[PDB]
Design a binder for this molecule. Structure first.
Ligand SMILES: Nc1ncnc2c1ncn2[C@@H]1O[C@H](CSCC[C@H](N)C(=O)O)[C@@H](O)[C@H]1O
Ligand SMILES: Nc1ncnc2c1ncn2[C@@H]1O[C@H](CSCC[C@H](N)C(=O)O)[C@@H](O)[C@H]1O
Lengths: 228, 228
């Protein structure tokens, strides 16, 4: 009888990159959870599912717990606490909640922060996978990531681990690349092997930018793909 | 006027894990390329997609070239040369061909072997991203893969590189897992960190099996997920 928490991957931007399953959950759940920063009117995940939500003859309740960009670790933790409290109030009343996530819910989505709390409160949890941004970026660039015996590495940051590991991998995905392109260029280009590098911003959206090398547009939604 | 080649990710098994975009392509292309071994009536990719194809009003031609069951010998390359000729003959006649691929076409897919040849012969090529099997596995397991500054490693087999790189990553995907889990287990167990492990066979299919730790013999479509 409890509501369940469902982590729903929404894909990289284009509504046509939602899965049939995602579309089905989102057309049916009574509650959607789409967290946002303080100066956002709506998260990017909510704007992706806008048309679906407004197509609905039935009403959907939107939970949009606020996450200030300025939170220190303790305030962030406390803001996840109250997010879980508003979500659990829905599940306590028998209503399923779909937590929408850009791309796929298993890849840097923040889903686990809510998920751990909700399962600790004794509720049940599910996940719907999606097109992750990095395979969508490979697709738009007309490029394959890995084949045969090649190793893929996915990083959110340029760090010392990244540097010492790089020679033992054949391809790598660099997330948040508007913050990370410069450091990334330096590390990858010091590698003696031939490399093919491309960066993609706003993949699958109207303002998508494909650029050779370690930069594209400077917005939050940029990813770099490296193949050796 | 010449047709174009489109690499279409079909997801891990469940037809509901298709994107709307893949559906759209699959409903309208005149030709589908779905290579197979002789021991199969249809590839796994074609069986995922069969109900879309049967339900079309407008008929579809299937190219299903047989490849020798071998991972090993560049006996495969002469077979790709002949399949590319087969595909090019459709493109030359102004017919689009969708090459369907399990999961996503950028991730250990066979698409790149056909793509390079078709592009070398002077035809246009496109990709439609899909739900990749490793994130679909994480979703069925109810586990997220990476958050925050965690680093993800995806490996097709477990060799010396895996061992040397492990302590520098926070999560790893082991593909073809029914064969590699033995050496994988030992490496993972000897890591000093707390860890959880889950193995998923036939993710999203009727006969999906999920079990904690290194499950030992899940057949071809089996993946192991490790988080530290
Ligand atoms: N549409 C898009 N185009 C390019 N990169 C994108 C993108 N959407 C998300 N990203 C990438 O994802 C990062 C946010 S972390 C969220 C990742 C998401 N769960 C996924 O599966 O893709 C961004 O910094 C960027 O690296
Ligand atoms: N339905 C499924 N369940 C579990 N693993 C799967 C799977 N489908 C594919 N795989 C994984 O993929 C490997 C074949 S490599 C093909 C990968 C595919 N392009 C994708 O994106 O997922 C298998 O050895 C297995 O590790």
């Amino acid at each position: 009888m409890h509501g369940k928490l469902i982590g729903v991957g929404v894909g990289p931007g284009d509504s046509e990159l939602l899965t049939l399953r995602a579309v089905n959950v989102l057309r049916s759940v009574p509650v959607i959870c789409a967290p946002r920063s303080s100066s956002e009117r709506e998260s990017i995940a909510l704007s992706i599912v806008e048309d679906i939500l407004t197509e609905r003859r039935d009403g959907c309740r939107i939970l949009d717990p606020v996450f200030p960009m300025t939170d220190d670790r303790d305030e962030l933790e406390s803001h996840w606490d109250s997010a879980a409290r508003m979500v659990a109030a829905e599940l306590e009343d028998g209503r399923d909640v779909a937590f929408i996530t850009l791309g796929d819910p298993s890849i840097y989505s923040t889903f686990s922060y809510l998920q751990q709390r909700i399962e600790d409160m004794g509720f049940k949890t599910e996940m719907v996978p999606g097109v992750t941004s990095f395979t969508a970026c490979a697709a738009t660039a007309g490029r394959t990531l890995v084949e045969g015996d090649e190793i893929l590495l996915v990083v959110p940051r340029v760090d010392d681990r990244f540097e010492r590991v790089l020679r033992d991998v054949d391809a790598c995905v660099i997330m948040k690349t508007s913050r990370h392109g410069r450091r990334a260029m330096e590390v990858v280009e010091s590698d003696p092997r031939g490399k093919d590098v491309v960066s993609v911003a706003n993949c699958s959206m109207d303002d998508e930018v494909v650029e050779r090398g370690f930069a594209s547009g400077g917005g939050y939604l940029a990813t770099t793909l490296v193949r050796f």
